[PDB]
């Protein structure tokens, strides 16, 4: 899915290619689950919204083509019974 | 199996198994009770309990109505029992 | 059929032997409206009915039909507290219908891989008095008989 273009919001895109430039920090809060994890993100802690909470995800080169939402899941399940 | 629908009401696991228990009375007749369905419902006068059940010899349908929910349910089973004894004994007039 | 009597349709005779009994049969072979299919089967079988046991496939067919039609059958009434299987004669209408039906039905239970062969063979044997169909006939007929004494509850 998604053929030619590589989709990152150009809102958190900006934020990552700044923090990397001067003295790289952490704690970037975002509500964009739609954003690809682009190799410039590799390592960081980004706070991703599942809709009631901003869930932090350490980035690793393990996961790149994915979306930032996949790692902050929307449902609290735990079981039945 | 047995399904219960609490319609426009907040019901509970405890009262659900109570209605499962009251319906158990029809097990007396030793005849298959097929996918029974009770519906509990409020009303300004009082509660309402409906049930519709099919058995090898026919189907049972009935409404209980009453102030107390529990006496409505009892009323429902009371009406159902009758219908069930009738499906079970009806042609015995076999002379 | 509350009201009057229910018409029995007549049937277009067939374009090979010009005989109604064949189309009824082909009708009974038919499945999901595919009639062309239902035809070749009967005729292919008719190839085979001549090929092996050289004869007149019409003859063989029309023979094994008379070898199937049940003369007497049970139809069960409730009297008092028991359901009696009751002896009654089958109408020529019903015998045809029961003839063709068991024929096919028993045909399709044969072990032969190709349908027309199954049709071929079942008919050849029924002509001779052997087979699933014929049994069902003799069977139905012994189940009548033995009930001869319920022949008074007869409509």
């Amino acid at each position: 899915s998604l053929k030619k273009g590589v989709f990152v919001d150009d809102h958190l895109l900006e934020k990552v290619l700044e923090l990397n430039a001067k003295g790289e920090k952490r704690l970037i809060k975002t509500w964009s689950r739609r954003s690809t994890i682009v190799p410039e993100m590799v390592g960081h802690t980004i706070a991703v919204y599942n809709g009631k909470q901003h869930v932090p995800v350490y980035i690793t080169e393990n996961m790149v083509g994915h979306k930032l939402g996949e790692f902050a899941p929307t449902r609290t399940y735990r079981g039945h019974g | 199996t047995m399904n219960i629908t609490s319609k426009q009401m907040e019901i509970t696991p405890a009262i659900r198994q109570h209605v499962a228990d009251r319906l158990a009375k029809l097990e007396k007749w030793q005849t298959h009770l097929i996918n029974p369905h009770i519906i509990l419902s409020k009303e300004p006068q009082g509660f309402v309990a409906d049930a519709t059940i099919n058995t090898p010899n026919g189907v049972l349908v009935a409404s209980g109505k009453h102030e107390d929910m529990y006496t409505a349910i009892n009323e429902l089973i009371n009406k159902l029992e009758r219908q069930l004894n009738k499906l079970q004994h009806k042609g015995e007039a076999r002379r | 059929a509350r009201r009057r009597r229910a018409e029995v349709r007549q049937l277009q005779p067939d374009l090979v032997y010009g005989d109604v009994l064949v189309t009824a049969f082909i009708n009974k072979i038919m499945r999901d409206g595919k009639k062309n299919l239902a035809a070749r089967i009967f005729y292919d079988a008719c190839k085979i009915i001549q090929e092996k046991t050289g004869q007149e496939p019409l003859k063989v067919f029309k023979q094994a039909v008379e070898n199937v039609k049940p003369r007497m059958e049970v139809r069960s009434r409730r009297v008092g507290g028991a359901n009696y299987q009751v002896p009654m004669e089958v109408s020529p209408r019903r015998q045809q219908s029961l003839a063709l039906r068991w024929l096919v039905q028993a045909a399709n239970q044969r072990p032969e891989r190709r349908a027309a062969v199954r049709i071929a063979h079942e008919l050849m044997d029924a002509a001779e008095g052997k087979g699933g169909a014929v049994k069902k006939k003799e069977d139905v007929e012994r189940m009548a008989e033995a009930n001869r004494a319920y022949a008074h509850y007869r409509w």
Partner: protein, 114 residues
Amino acid sequence: ARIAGVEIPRNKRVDVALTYIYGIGKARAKEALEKTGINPATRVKDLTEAEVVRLREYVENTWKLEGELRAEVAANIKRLMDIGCYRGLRHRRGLPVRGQRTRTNARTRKGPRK
């Protein structure tokens, strides 16, 4: 064994017989009977092991394959169950993946019911 990732398929046609290997479908099958010019209708039984050794050698060296694949494959799940992943966290629960409803059905992924 016989051939390829060590299945053995005698007595039926070769385009089919090859399917009986992991990784080889009706698609990959028709390929290699072209590239080796072995004639797909010939049943394995009449091979000329010459053809067979040719058949083995291409298929064996070209893609991957019995016991591989499913090793390599499973490794992705062990990856995807490792990373985040959601669709990862769903293999971890033996639950369906591709967005099907879980309220009903879903029995292939859940097994018979109780």
